[PDB]
Design an enzyme around this catalytic site. Structure first.
Site, PDB file in Angstrom:
ATOM      1  N   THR A   1       0.806  -1.183   0.000  1.00 41.79           N
ATOM      2  CA  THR A   1       0.000   0.000   0.000  1.00 41.79           C
ATOM      3  C   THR A   1       0.848   1.245   0.000  1.00 41.79           C
ATOM      4  O   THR A   1       0.423   2.282  -0.535  1.00 41.79           O
ATOM      5  CB  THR A   1      -0.946   0.042   1.185  1.00 41.79           C
ATOM      6  OG1 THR A   1      -0.254  -0.247   2.394  1.00 41.79           O
ATOM      7  CG2 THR A   1      -2.086  -0.943   0.986  1.00 41.79           C
TER       8      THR A   1
ATOM      9  N   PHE B   1      -6.212   5.001   6.854  1.00 46.17           N
ATOM     10  CA  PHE B   1      -5.482   4.082   7.762  1.00 46.17           C
ATOM     11  C   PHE B   1      -6.451   3.389   8.730  1.00 46.17           C
ATOM     12  O   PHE B   1      -6.018   2.853   9.768  1.00 46.17           O
ATOM     13  CB  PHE B   1      -4.363   4.855   8.519  1.00 46.17           C
ATOM     14  CG  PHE B   1      -3.301   5.350   7.627  1.00 46.17           C
ATOM     15  CD1 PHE B   1      -2.399   4.507   7.062  1.00 46.17           C
ATOM     16  CD2 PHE B   1      -3.236   6.695   7.299  1.00 46.17           C
ATOM     17  CE1 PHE B   1      -1.440   4.960   6.154  1.00 46.17           C
ATOM     18  CE2 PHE B   1      -2.270   7.170   6.396  1.00 46.17           C
ATOM     19  CZ  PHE B   1      -1.378   6.307   5.830  1.00 46.17           C
TER      20      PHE B   1
ATOM     21  N   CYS C   1      -4.315   1.316  11.290  1.00 45.61           N
ATOM     22  CA  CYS C   1      -3.001   0.932  10.786  1.00 45.61           C
ATOM     23  C   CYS C   1      -1.913   1.123  11.867  1.00 45.61           C
ATOM     24  O   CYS C   1      -1.695   2.275  12.332  1.00 45.61           O
ATOM     25  CB  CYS C   1      -2.618   1.791   9.554  1.00 45.61           C
ATOM     26  SG  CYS C   1      -1.102   1.223   8.831  1.00 45.61           S
TER      27      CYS C   1
END
Ligand SMILES: Cc1cc2nc3c(=O)[nH]c(=O)nc-3n(C[C@H](O)[C@H](O)[C@H](O)COP(=O)(O)OP(=O)(O)OC[C@H]3O[C@@H](n4cnc5c(N)ncnc54)[C@H](O)[C@@H]3O)c2cc1C
Ligand code: HEM
Ligand SMILES: Cc1cc2nc3c(=O)[nH]c(=O)nc-3n(C[C@H](O)[C@H](O)[C@H](O)COP(=O)(O)O)c2cc1C
Ligand SMILES: COc1ccc2nc(SCc3ncc(C)c(OC)c3C)[nH]c2c1
Lengths: 458, 403, 173, 57, 57
Positions: free
Chosen positions: A266, A391, A398
């Protein structure tokens, strides 16, 4: 209210809508058509796709909803196991690993990864400095070389040496194949048709290639006179303060694969989209290039210098706004509840947050949501809660957010200091889906600024 | 021969560029016991400025104070040496490079009050038992406030007092703060020369409050000793609080700026003078200036009297020390003129104060509010709200300092 | 390798225009590291809404004529009007950088933040602290600090015994 | 000289960057270095052989 | 050896220079004169690298 639903295919309901190489983009088009919420049904399965900050702010209430494993994530658990990404919040291994590994993303840890990030970034700048006239750059390919190597080196003291390879690294080839297969599985009406016998076989062999590499990292470290005070050190050595226990061997292997993939794919996507938007917005490119030159005065960037790159930061967040590279996450209702005062849910009901649509909510962002304008992020405080979520959310957000952003900011800063870029093909955006998103076929040429060198004498 | 300057870090932190002094001269009269300097500085193509901007000056430590250190450590100025730590360092020292003692000593503050860390370091190297007891006494809350902070007692003065404190040079240097820039209110207008700027610098000097001999302020004495052709490291700084002339040159101004406080108003005066020469009409502009005496510290008298003659300003002076006159300060004159000054502010005047922020500014502010109260027959609270509103409209600006 | 006991999460946020508050903040984060925390330093108006629902958050800020510094405005505004996204769970403490030379506005921003944070669900673990630049800023900063570590000590866990000089960390040449 | 150093630094770096127990195919790497060195010194042309996993075409 | 003060001062006097004036040289051409080139260095220390009283060539 009764919620909208896209077109149906008799007994398959909406399943065939996912029979496409670009299913997130298809879902996005359905959202534009149907609005902030729609039901999506398959045989035996329902989920509800959310696109408005109005509903998503409620979905993000952790007292009412928890992280769900979407179908996609259930297929990826086949190799991600009960690693941090595919573990349920209530599985013992989630909080234990969260607690053991969060210290690897502390400020001190980040400072200590800087030198190794620079190592890989210097390798990318050098490859480009060393191209001949009129040669070009395969952008997402080179961004993957850089991001995989960066997590390999910073996380595990392991060198994939991707810049010494003309094809993609074997680990990337099997990763992409495995993600592709998980994605294609989403549309399958009869996953045990023996027509998919070969698919499953290729899947296991790709899982094997990825696990063979994991075994090597583990073997190197057992050899590693290891302080290698890094993510792997914490995996093998840290104890969770709550239970007092360390991770066992099985879970550690899942963590390694999880971090090797989530830790690069990503970020590669983000850098690719960011370069894409810069070359298509020459005034934004120049303003970012100006900052890079102004800030990055030394031969290699310092940690404090990367933190000085505000506009570059803005560029990256704006790339994530338009094309968040992990474009969906899923939630389940912890108890019966009502969404938006109009949509009753029962305990266990599933939601999907369709991040690129959230990021296009005109009530939040204004009418010009398709424009690339980093200035939107000049004061990030101004953005309402749960409006910008590339995120993810809450305690399941994340873990590597700061690592990705530090890396991206460092790399893009160096690229902008060291070269002028040309969109020589007038590239038409084509977004490849592997659950994650990335430009496909994006190419540029880079003319070195010799940070100046042209020197004669004869 | 890049005859070149250290681009010490701070110079980089402030965007300070290196450049030349084009003029340097005394502003007070022969026989004044005090000094105020006027310096003109050249600016490179990349720099530019506006009225009410500040010059950031990275100063050097003077010879006297550098010699006190090398004497205390028994070192030669020119002795080349190399430091190292492993640990971070706001003290922005060239580490892992060889560099003389005297040049190391241009990176640090030598006369900040002694810090508690500094005192502990000294105590730990002291083999004079009663002397260790004394240094530790200074760590207590009360003693530290009264004997260290109130008198500005430095580490250097304590090392001189305690010659058998075994601290060593390299530990000294590392315990000190990084050298800070000093700000000066640019006293010229860019409308006269875009690439040249002036500053007006009162020279700090007296008996040290610590009791250790004679005190000299670091930047001010550095600036006082520069001459035409010397180089200087500085940058332009723009203050968060705007301090500029109204957009319309007929909008009336009241300026209060005694002593070196006149500085930014000299820029205002020069600006108005050019605007006139370009056919713009100017409104009323009152400059309240105060000093000891015209025989002593009436800075820029000739210029200000000329300005007034050309209708650029109306000048009101107050003198504190004229024989056979009452001690007069600007606020006393302002108070006589209350009616007029308040009518002006009712017609949209801007009010400006520059100079001493600890005593002069507050007293000027109190006199303005009291003039309001008396003229408009309102309470002190209404007068305070009036001033608050004036500031929120952008019409009551301060360029004051404790220094 | 260090010893890394607590390792509890200490986030330190600053509001600063000229760096006094920012250096104080980074100093705190430096002594936290010595006391086993997992400190993080950032501006105030960058965690606007993202107050830590775990550990504690030290808030070090100045005032400018009664207003927040340029890197703190988004935070306070978010704090002032916005209150909906309650500040429950957030166990904090506030240190004020001010100057007595500013009459009626003395420590107005730290005060605002401190008391506003509490009229929104406070876990105020340690009473605010003030520094007067016009007098003895290191005295007060010192008082608030020692009292501070202990307040949070007793509250949660118990990492440093006397800094154990996890401090002296010279480095020179 | 400077251009020879450029390629020689590329060879030393490849080897510095191998993981534990990886090995070096000697004549293969010597060919990467020598072809690149004549390409660059002789013709200002970069074969970029150290960016390739197989031999250059 | 080092050049003594008297003879260093004769040079800085002849050129109107201060001993402490930092400066930086450059050529492109070789230099038995073994001078720190592309570094900033005072005049007085530059003057400790050279012979000041050899016959004129
Ligand atoms: C925004 C702003 C604008 C300014 N504009 C001007 C200007 O235009 N012109 C100007 O002249 N100054 C101006 N100043 C003040 C200026 O920046 C310097 O602070 C001043 O010149 C003193 O710095 P210095 O290094 O010479 O003395 P320093 O070495 O910094 O010493 C200063 C300190 O010494 C103290 N001190 C004074 N006397 C003694 C004593 N006898 N014993 C012990 N301590 C003593 C002072 O109180 C002060 O605390 C301005 C300041 C600011 C903040
Ligand atoms: C721009 C780059 C990144 C994006 C856009 C991204 C996105 C996300 C998202 C959306 C989630 C939540 C998933 C869910 O709710 O199902 C997530 C979780 C996660 N991310 Fe990232 N990520 C990025 C970079 C990284 C990096 C560099 C790492 C590793 C260093 C990483 C590791 C993980 C982990 C382990 C999780 C699961 C955390 C948990 O549930 O405990 N990410 N990521
Ligand atoms: C223009 C200006 C306005 C100020 N206003 C106030 C104020 O309203 N209240 C206060 O307590 N201190 C005030 N101060 C004092 C500052 O807050 C003090 O210097 C603070 O320590 C500066 O912190 P910082 O460098 O991080 O920005 C002001 C200072 C300046 C320069
Ligand atoms: C229809 O179902 C879908 C489709 C696409 C999807 N893309 C996603 S994004 C899922 C995702 N998120 C974050 C990370 C770090 C990650 O690691 C590779 C993955 C696979 N979920 C989807 C669900």
């Amino acid at each position: 209210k009764e919620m909208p639903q896209p077109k149906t295919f008799g007994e398959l309901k909406n399943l065939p809508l996912l029979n496409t190489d670009k299913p997130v983009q298809a879902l996005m088009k359905i959202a534009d058509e149907l609005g902030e919420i729609f039901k999506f049904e398959a045989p035996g399965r329902v989920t509800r796709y959310l696109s408005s900050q109005r509903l998503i702010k409620e979905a993000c209430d952790e007292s009412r909803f928890d992280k769900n494993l979407s179908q996609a994530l259930k297929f990826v658990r086949d190799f991600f196991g009960d690693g941090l990404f595919t573990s349920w919040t209530h599985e013992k291994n989630w909080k234990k690993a969260h607690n053991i590994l969060l210290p690897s993303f502390s400020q001190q840890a980040m400072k200590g990864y800087h030198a190794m990030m620079v190592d890989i970034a210097v390798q990318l700048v050098q490859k480009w400095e060393r191209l001949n006239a009129d040669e070009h750059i395969e952008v997402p390919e080179d961004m993957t070389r850089l991001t995989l190597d960066t997590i390999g080196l910073c996380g595990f003291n392991y060198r994939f040496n991707s810049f010494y390879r003309d094809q993609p690294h074997p680990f990337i080839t099997s990763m992409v194949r495995a993600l592709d297969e998980a994605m294609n599985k989403l549309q399958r009406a009869n996953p045990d048709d023996p027509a998919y016998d070969e698919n499953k076989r290729q899947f296991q062999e790709d899982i094997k290639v990825m696990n063979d590499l994991v075994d090597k990292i583990i073997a190197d470290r057992k050899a590693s006179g290891e302080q290698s005070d890094d993510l792997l050190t914490h995996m093998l050595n840290g104890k969770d303060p709550e239970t007092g226990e360390p991770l066992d061997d099985e879970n550690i292997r899942y963590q390694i694969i999880t971090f090797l993939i989530a830790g690069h794919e990503t970020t590669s996507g983000l850098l690719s989209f960011a370069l894409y938007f810069l070359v298509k917005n020459p005034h934004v490119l120049q303003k970012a290039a100006e900052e890079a030159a102004r800030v990055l005065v030394d031969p290699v960037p310092s940690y404090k210098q990367v933190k000085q790159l505000k506009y570059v930061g803005m560029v990256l967040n704006e790339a994530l706004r338009l094309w968040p590279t992990a474009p969906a996450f899923s939630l389940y209702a912890k108890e019966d509840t009502v969404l938006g005062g109009e949509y009753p849910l029962e305990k266990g009901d599933e939601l999907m947050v369709l991040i690129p649509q959230l990021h296009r909510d005109k009530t939040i962002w204004g009418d010009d949501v398709e424009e690339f304008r980093p200035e939107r992020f000049e004061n990030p405080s101004a953005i309402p809660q749960h409006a910008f979520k590339p995120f993810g959310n809450g305690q399941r957000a994340c873990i590597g957010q700061q690592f990705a952003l530090h890396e991206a900011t460092l790399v893009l800063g160096m690229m902008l200091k060291h070269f002028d870029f040309e969109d020589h093909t007038n590239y038409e955006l084509d977004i490849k889906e592997t659950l994650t998103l990335k430009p496909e076929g994006f190419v540029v040429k880079a003319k070195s600024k010799k940070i100046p060198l042209k020197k004669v004498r004869k | 021969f890049v005859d070149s300057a250290a681009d010490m870090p701070l110079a980089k932190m402030h965007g300070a560029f290196s450049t030349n002094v084009v003029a340097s001269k005394e502003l007070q009269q022969p026989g004044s016991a005090r000094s105020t300097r006027h310096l003109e500085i050249e600016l490179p193509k990349e720099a530019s400025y506006q009225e009410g901007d500040h010059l950031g000056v990275i100063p050097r430590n003077y010879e006297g104070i550098v010699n006190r250190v090398t004497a205390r450590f028994g070192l030669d100025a020119s002795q080349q040496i190399r430091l190292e730590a492993e640990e971070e360092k706001l003290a922005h020292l060239p580490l892992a490079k060889t560099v003389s003692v005297e040049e190391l000593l241009q990176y640090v503050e030598l006369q900040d009050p002694v810090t508690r860390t500094q005192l502990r370091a000294m105590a730990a190297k002291t083999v004079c038992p009663p002397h260790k007891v004394e240094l530790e006494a200074l760590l207590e809350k009360q003693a530290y406030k009264e004997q260290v902070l109130a008198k500005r007692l430095t580490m250097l003065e304590l090392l001189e007092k305690y010659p058998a404190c075994e601290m060593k040079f390299s530990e000294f240097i590392a315990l000190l703060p990084s050298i800070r820039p000093r700000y000066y209110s640019i006293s010229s207008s860019p409308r006269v020369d875009e690439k040249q700027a002036s500053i007006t610098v009162s020279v700090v000097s007296g008996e040290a409050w610590s009791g250790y001999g004679e005190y000299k302020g670091i930047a001010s004495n550095y600036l006082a000793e520069l001459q035409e052709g010397d180089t200087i490291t500085c940058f332009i700084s723009t203050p968060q609080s705007e301090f500029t002339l109204p957009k319309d040159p007929e909008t009336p101004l009241i300026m209060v700026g005694p002593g070196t406080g006149v500085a930014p108003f000299r820029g205002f005066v020069q600006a108005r003078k050019q605007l006139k020469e370009q056919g713009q009409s100017l409104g009323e502009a009152h400059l309240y200036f105060g000093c000891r005496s015209p025989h002593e510290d009436y800075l820029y008298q000739e210029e200000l009297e000329n300005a007034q003659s050309e209708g650029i300003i109306t000048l009101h002076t107050a003198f504190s020390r004229m024989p056979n006159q009452p001690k007069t300060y600007v606020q006393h004159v302002m108070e006589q003129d209350g009616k007029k000054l308040i009518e002006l502010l009712d017609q949209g005047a801007h009010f400006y104060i520059c100079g001493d922020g600890s005593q002069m500014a507050p007293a000027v502010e109190a006199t303005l509010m009291k003039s309001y109260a008396d003229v408009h027959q309102v309470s002190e609270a209404d007068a305070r709200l009036w001033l608050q509103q004036l500031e929120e409209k952008g019409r009551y600006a301060k360029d004051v300092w404790a220094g | 390798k260090a010893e890394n006991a607590h390792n509890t999460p200490l986030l330190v946020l600053y509001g600063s225009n000229m760096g006094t508050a920012e250096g104080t903040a980074r100093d705190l984060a430096d002594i936290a590291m010595s006391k086993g925390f997992a400190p993080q330093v950032a501006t105030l108006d960058s965690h606007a809404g993202n107050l830590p629902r775990e550990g504690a958050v030290l808030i070090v800020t100045a005032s400018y004529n009664g207003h927040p510094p340029d890197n703190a405005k988004q935070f306070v505004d978010w704090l002032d009007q916005a209150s909906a996204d309650e500040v429950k769970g957030v166990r904090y403490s506030v240190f004020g950088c001010g100057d007595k030379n500013w009459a009626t506005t003395y420590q107005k921003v730290p005060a605002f933040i401190d008391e506003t944070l509490a009229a929104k669900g406070a876990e105020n673990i340690a009473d605010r602290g003030e520094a007067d630049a016009s007098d003895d800023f290191e005295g007060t900063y010192e008082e608030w600090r020692e009292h501070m570590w202990s307040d949070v000590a007793a509250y949660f866990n118990l990492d440093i015994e006397n800094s154990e000089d996890n401090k002296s960390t010279l480095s020179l040449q």
